[PDB]
Design a protein around this motif. Structure first.
Motif, PDB file in Angstrom:
ATOM      1  N   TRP A   1       0.842  -1.192   0.000  1.00 52.01           N
ATOM      2  CA  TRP A   1       0.000   0.000   0.000  1.00 52.01           C
ATOM      3  C   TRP A   1       0.872   1.235   0.000  1.00 52.01           C
ATOM      4  N   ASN A   2       1.074   1.790  -1.196  1.00 58.25           N
ATOM      5  CA  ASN A   2       1.963   2.909  -1.477  1.00 58.25           C
ATOM      6  C   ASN A   2       3.418   2.574  -1.187  1.00 58.25           C
ATOM      7  N   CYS A   3       3.819   1.299  -1.360  1.00 51.17           N
ATOM      8  CA  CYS A   3       5.214   0.912  -1.176  1.00 51.17           C
ATOM      9  C   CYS A   3       5.723   0.647  -2.601  1.00 51.17           C
ATOM     10  N   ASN A   4       6.330   1.662  -3.238  1.00 52.08           N
ATOM     11  CA  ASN A   4       6.713   1.604  -4.651  1.00 52.08           C
ATOM     12  C   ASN A   4       7.897   0.705  -4.945  1.00 52.08           C
ATOM     13  N   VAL A   5       7.654  -0.417  -5.626  1.00 50.41           N
ATOM     14  CA  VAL A   5       8.728  -1.330  -5.970  1.00 50.41           C
ATOM     15  C   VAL A   5       8.892  -1.404  -7.510  1.00 50.41           C
ATOM     16  N   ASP A   6      10.055  -1.878  -7.960  1.00 48.31           N
ATOM     17  CA  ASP A   6      10.353  -2.006  -9.380  1.00 48.31           C
ATOM     18  C   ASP A   6       9.463  -3.068 -10.102  1.00 48.31           C
ATOM     19  N   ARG A   7       9.175  -4.186  -9.431  1.00 47.35           N
ATOM     20  CA  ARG A   7       8.356  -5.235 -10.010  1.00 47.35           C
ATOM     21  C   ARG A   7       7.659  -5.959  -8.897  1.00 47.35           C
ATOM     22  N   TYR A   8       6.335  -5.884  -8.881  1.00 42.11           N
ATOM     23  CA  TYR A   8       5.564  -6.556  -7.851  1.00 42.11           C
ATOM     24  C   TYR A   8       5.490  -8.071  -8.062  1.00 42.11           C
ATOM     25  N   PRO A   9       5.603  -8.846  -6.972  1.00 39.71           N
ATOM     26  CA  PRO A   9       5.413 -10.296  -7.089  1.00 39.71           C
ATOM     27  C   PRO A   9       3.972 -10.605  -7.550  1.00 39.71           C
TER      28      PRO A   9
ATOM     29  N   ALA B   1       8.780   8.042 -10.637  1.00 30.66           N
ATOM     30  CA  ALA B   1       7.955   7.951 -11.833  1.00 30.66           C
ATOM     31  C   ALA B   1       7.131   6.672 -11.960  1.00 30.66           C
ATOM     32  N   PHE B   2       5.838   6.850 -12.267  1.00 30.50           N
ATOM     33  CA  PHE B   2       4.914   5.759 -12.515  1.00 30.50           C
ATOM     34  C   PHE B   2       5.447   4.922 -13.708  1.00 30.50           C
TER      35      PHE B   2
ATOM     36  N   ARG C   1      -0.659   2.041  -5.978  1.00 33.01           N
ATOM     37  CA  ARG C   1       0.483   2.772  -6.499  1.00 33.01           C
ATOM     38  C   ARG C   1       0.030   4.151  -7.020  1.00 33.01           C
ATOM     39  N   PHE C   2       0.619   5.239  -6.501  1.00 31.34           N
ATOM     40  CA  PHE C   2       0.302   6.602  -6.929  1.00 31.34           C
ATOM     41  C   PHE C   2       0.856   6.837  -8.345  1.00 31.34           C
ATOM     42  N   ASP C   3      -0.012   7.275  -9.255  1.00 30.98           N
ATOM     43  CA  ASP C   3       0.345   7.582 -10.635  1.00 30.98           C
ATOM     44  C   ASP C   3       0.779   9.036 -10.695  1.00 30.98           C
ATOM     45  N   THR C   4       2.096   9.238 -10.800  1.00 27.51           N
ATOM     46  CA  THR C   4       2.744  10.539 -10.803  1.00 27.51           C
ATOM     47  C   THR C   4       2.313  11.448 -11.957  1.00 27.51           C
ATOM     48  N   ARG C   5       1.801  10.874 -13.057  1.00 28.21           N
ATOM     49  CA  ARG C   5       1.375  11.682 -14.198  1.00 28.21           C
ATOM     50  C   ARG C   5       0.081  12.453 -13.940  1.00 28.21           C
ATOM     51  N   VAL C   6      -0.695  12.110 -12.886  1.00 26.91           N
ATOM     52  CA  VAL C   6      -1.981  12.770 -12.608  1.00 26.91           C
ATOM     53  C   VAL C   6      -1.872  14.284 -12.474  1.00 26.91           C
TER      54      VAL C   6
ATOM     55  N   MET D   1     -10.519   8.687  -4.811  1.00 27.32           N
ATOM     56  CA  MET D   1      -9.187   8.112  -4.721  1.00 27.32           C
ATOM     57  C   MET D   1      -8.506   7.909  -6.099  1.00 27.32           C
ATOM     58  N   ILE D   2      -9.259   7.395  -7.075  1.00 28.87           N
ATOM     59  CA  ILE D   2      -8.748   7.148  -8.416  1.00 28.87           C
ATOM     60  C   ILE D   2      -8.418   8.471  -9.084  1.00 28.87           C
ATOM     61  N   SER D   3      -9.320   9.433  -8.975  1.00 26.69           N
ATOM     62  CA  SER D   3      -9.142  10.744  -9.580  1.00 26.69           C
ATOM     63  C   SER D   3      -8.002  11.541  -8.908  1.00 26.69           C
ATOM     64  N   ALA D   4      -7.703  11.271  -7.625  1.00 21.64           N
ATOM     65  CA  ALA D   4      -6.566  11.895  -6.951  1.00 21.64           C
ATOM     66  C   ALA D   4      -5.206  11.357  -7.478  1.00 21.64           C
ATOM     67  N   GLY D   5      -5.218  10.301  -8.305  1.00 21.55           N
ATOM     68  CA  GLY D   5      -4.008   9.728  -8.880  1.00 21.55           C
ATOM     69  C   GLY D   5      -3.647   8.315  -8.465  1.00 21.55           C
ATOM     70  N   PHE D   6      -4.328   7.742  -7.465  1.00 20.29           N
ATOM     71  CA  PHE D   6      -4.022   6.381  -7.038  1.00 20.29           C
ATOM     72  C   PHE D   6      -4.527   5.332  -8.022  1.00 20.29           C
ATOM     73  N   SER D   7      -3.764   4.249  -8.205  1.00 18.36           N
ATOM     74  CA  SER D   7      -4.148   3.147  -9.085  1.00 18.36           C
ATOM     75  C   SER D   7      -4.078   1.835  -8.293  1.00 18.36           C
ATOM     76  N   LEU D   8      -5.044   0.938  -8.519  1.00 18.51           N
ATOM     77  CA  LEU D   8      -5.130  -0.332  -7.800  1.00 18.51           C
ATOM     78  C   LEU D   8      -4.871  -1.545  -8.676  1.00 18.51           C
ATOM     79  N   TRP D   9      -4.049  -2.468  -8.163  1.00 23.37           N
ATOM     80  CA  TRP D   9      -3.614  -3.658  -8.884  1.00 23.37           C
ATOM     81  C   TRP D   9      -3.747  -4.888  -7.983  1.00 23.37           C
ATOM     82  N   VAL D  10      -4.037  -6.052  -8.582  1.00 23.18           N
ATOM     83  CA  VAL D  10      -4.255  -7.268  -7.813  1.00 23.18           C
ATOM     84  C   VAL D  10      -3.737  -8.514  -8.543  1.00 23.18           C
ATOM     85  N   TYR D  11      -3.495  -9.601  -7.774  1.00 22.00           N
ATOM     86  CA  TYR D  11      -3.127 -10.905  -8.311  1.00 22.00           C
ATOM     87  C   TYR D  11      -4.161 -11.376  -9.353  1.00 22.00           C
ATOM     88  N   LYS D  12      -3.678 -11.979 -10.461  1.00 24.49           N
ATOM     89  CA  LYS D  12      -4.541 -12.375 -11.584  1.00 24.49           C
ATOM     90  C   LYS D  12      -5.711 -13.322 -11.251  1.00 24.49           C
ATOM     91  N   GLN D  13      -5.623 -14.110 -10.181  1.00 25.27           N
ATOM     92  CA  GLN D  13      -6.702 -15.043  -9.814  1.00 25.27           C
ATOM     93  C   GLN D  13      -7.868 -14.373  -9.068  1.00 25.27           C
TER      94      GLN D  13
END
Ligand SMILES: CCNC(=O)Nc1cc(C)on1
Ligand SMILES: CCNC(=O)Nc1cc(C)on1
Ligand SMILES: [Zn+2]
Ligand SMILES: [Zn+2]
Ligand SMILES: [Zn+2]
Length: 459
Positions: A326-334, A371-372, A341-346, A436-448
């Motif tokens: 939760w807002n812990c920016n990593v290079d590649r998520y497991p 950078a996002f 993840r905050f989208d810096t382009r917003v 939250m989405i419009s403020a720049g945050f983006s949500l991602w989840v495991y494919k299953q």
């Protein structure tokens, strides 16, 4: 020592190509005087035009990089460049405007600063890499004096009109011609070796040198953002509320509880690895799951490398259960992750331009975010909207239209008709989600992850 003393020394070495013969011994008192301004021994809230690094940090929303380049200087045209990307040509007779006299240039300067700053700050801080011409051009668009209030409101005055002899803030300055009581800081006073481009290019590849004054103004502000927010991080500085800060933060907490709670119910992970905020609390305190925390402050320079966060001998098995970033920016998520993840382009009043693609997100505190990067999420998918509730169907206590929705995951929707309570809660949650989405945050989840798995939690 709240403000910068006028009797503080100012290093003039960076000024001597535009101003040959400049005295080495120089104070702000003498510099302001040579810039054509008179402080008149005034004790009225404006002790110095120049401010400390600490004062500039607290007023980061007011920062406007400013550079002046000689086109040909009383006898020659000047190119005025601002970190807004604007270039104005002033004649003494990447937007590029043709040569115009100072009386019209100053009207444009007031308009541009007013439109950029009215929803960000109560002032302007001109961020400089001072070489001479920018300082000597200020007398043509700046007026100073005692601290004043706006003629149409209680906000402090930032503009002056010679036509009406009145003062205005950034909101009520249409038709005003002078910037009133601006602030400024010379980045060259911080102690650097070499020119602006060599120091900027050490930390940033996104801003290039197209050889116009606005490129230098942008590079100067970017270098100052790097020094004060990227390599030096201060989470004890609070910033005023200028928009939807509280709603965004409340929404972020609501969304986190909702998403994690439904991931635990849908896939029944035996362990959750919570990576980030050393002061985090369990977002789903009633969940059965084994909750394990790993401390990581928000990264402000480059994204964390998952190999350094995870590999060095913890449950040890981060592959077991689920990982929450939760807002812990990593290079590649497991692949077994729940991610915010905050989208810096917003584009927003909270999000200011940052260094090397990153952005400076200012909501209570200033967070420079790397950078996002879309490739960080290759093992995951975008988290779709859904509302989940297992609370009883009961109203308690705003009018109504019956709600029909495939994403209202409740016992009442399973049973055919959404109850009034879950309809009110769904719409409130959808509003929080959109905020939250419009403020720049983006949500991602495991494919299953599948919301179809939540329907059998009502049996
Ligand atoms: C700081 C402003 N100075 C000037 O405009 N002129 C000069 C010229 C010399 C020498 O020192 N200051
Ligand atoms: C380490 C998790 N991040 C925070 O504690 N806060 C943040 C980071 C961003 C971006 O916005 N809030
Ligand atoms: Zn006003
Ligand atoms: Zn840059
Ligand atoms: Zn219901």
């Amino acid at each position: 020592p709240t403000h910068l003393s006028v009797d503080t020394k100012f290093k003039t070495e960076g000024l001597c190509v535009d101003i040959p013969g400049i005295p080495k011994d120089m104070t702000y008192r003498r510099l302001i005087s040579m810039m054509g301004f008179k402080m008149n021994y005034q004790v009225n809230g404006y002790p110095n035009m120049f401010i400390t690094r600490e004062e500039a940090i607290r007023h980061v929303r007011a920062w406007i990089g400013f550079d002046v380049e000689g086109c040909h200087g009383t006898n020659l045209p000047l190119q005025l460049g601002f970190s807004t990307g604007v270039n104005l040509v002033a004649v003494p007779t990447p937007l590029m405007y043709k040569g115009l006299p100072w009386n019209v240039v100053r009207i444009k300067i007031v308009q541009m600063l007013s439109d950029t700053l009215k929803n960000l700050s109560d002032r302007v801080v001109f961020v400089l890499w001072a070489h001479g011409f920018e300082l000597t051009s200020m007398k043509y668009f700046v007026k100073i004096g005692p601290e004043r209030t706006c003629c149409l409101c209680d906000r402090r005055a930032t503009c002056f009109s010679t036509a009406s002899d009145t003062y205005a803030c950034w909101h009520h300055s249409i038709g005003f011609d002078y910037v009133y009581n601006p602030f400024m800081i010379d980045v060259q006073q911080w102690g650097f070796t070499g020119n602006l481009q060599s120091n900027h290019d050490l930390y940033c590849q996104v801003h290039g040198n197209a050889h116009v004054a606005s490129c230098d103004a942008i590079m100067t502000r970017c270098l100052a953002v790097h020094e004060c927010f990227v390599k030096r991080v201060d989470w004890t500085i609070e910033y005023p509320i200028i928009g939807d800060e509280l709603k965004i933060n409340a929404a972020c907490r609501k969304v986190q509880h909702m998403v994690v709670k439904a991931a635990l119910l849908a896939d029944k992970f035996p362990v959750l690895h919570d990576i980030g905020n050393p002061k985090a609390i369990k977002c789903v305190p009633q969940a059965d799951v084994e909750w394990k925390f790993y401390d990581a402050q928000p990264c402000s320079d480059k994204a964390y490398k998952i190999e350094e966060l995870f590999y060095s001998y913890h449950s040890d098995k981060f592959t077991d259960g689920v990982c929450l970033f939760w807002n812990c920016n990593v290079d590649r998520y497991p692949a077994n992750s729940i991610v915010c993840r905050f989208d810096t382009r917003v584009l927003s009043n909270l999000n200011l331009p940052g260094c090397d693609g990153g952005s400076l997100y200012v909501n209570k505190h200033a967070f420079h975010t790397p950078a996002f990067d879309k490739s960080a999420f290759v093992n995951l998918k975008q988290l779709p909207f859904f509302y989940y509730s297992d609370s009883p169907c009961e109203s308690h206590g705003i009018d109504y239209v019956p709600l029909k929705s495939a994403t209202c995951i409740t016992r009442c929707n399973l049973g055919g008709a959404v109850c009034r309570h879950h309809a009110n809660e769904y719409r409130l949650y959808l509003d929080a989600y959109n905020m939250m989405i419009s403020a720049g945050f983006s949500l991602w989840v495991y494919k299953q992850f599948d919301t179809y798995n939540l329907w059998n939690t009502f049996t």
